[PDB]
Amino acid sequence: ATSTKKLHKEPATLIKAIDGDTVKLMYKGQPMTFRLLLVDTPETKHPKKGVEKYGPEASAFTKKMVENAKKIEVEFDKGQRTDKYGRWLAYIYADGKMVNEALVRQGLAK
Template sequence: MSLSVIFNKSVLVGVVCLAAISASAYVIWGTRSSEPVPERVTGGEVKRVISGDYIKIEPDGRVKYAGINVPSAEDPLGAKTMELNRKLVDGKKIRMRFDETEKDKEGRWLAYVFVDGEMVNKRLVAEGLAYVRLKAGERRYAQELLAAQAEAREAGLGLWEKPVRSTEPRYPGDRKHGAFHRPACADVANTRPGNEVVFRNKQEAFDAGFAPCGHCRP
């Protein structure tokens, strides 16, 4: 057998072995399963009320109420919001419905929470203890929530006890985050192109489902 034939056979064997290794690698990497998609949550039992719009349930963990924004713990109305939320849901079985965005950046479920057929998110707004805040992906019940807010404002409840007064010539808003600001607020510069909106007064912002910025507090 000539040297050239031996060389060609060696090359052929090498190519076959390389192909086999490549095929094996393809099988291992190509069939690697992706992370499972979490199942849609439909309900659970409330084990702890953390704030006016934040609870823990079993079996699925932490839940943040979608479409609304409640007063901070430092606000005089914060304690009332917490008290009502506890009264409505603590220790009870709830049903949850979801919007386009099912979880926030902290990994909490974003949900419209129902107890005995009543939407808790809407009840807090109707009592004047929460603003409507229609962030991107949280607008499923926009009309219901805005109607409840208008009624609470008309009745002068909670957050609406004092008339809405505009002290700035305009109020820049961010459609993605559903918030409006004072013109000098540092957060205005963080609004991405296409998400900007400007309101002539605070009333326009509230009617559109925007809540006051927590930093500049317009």
């Protein structure tokens, strides 16, 4: 049923986050917005609430780590069913560590 395609690693500099999920990404000189997949909930497992209760981790931290690190690679597939050029899947991370992997590991420092 579910076909697992080979997702390659592509470098893209995230300029700024919008609503935590939909974020802009400078893709090989040509920026594209992206809609992450990791959808979880605050204090619960991973249901519906990609934007956990932290505050900046989304709009303030997302692009922040991208401006602090010179390595922003997105684990996005090269066959993501996008609408136009802004709803691409990905796991933007700076210096190896993903924005979500930043402080969401201990409980997003507020």
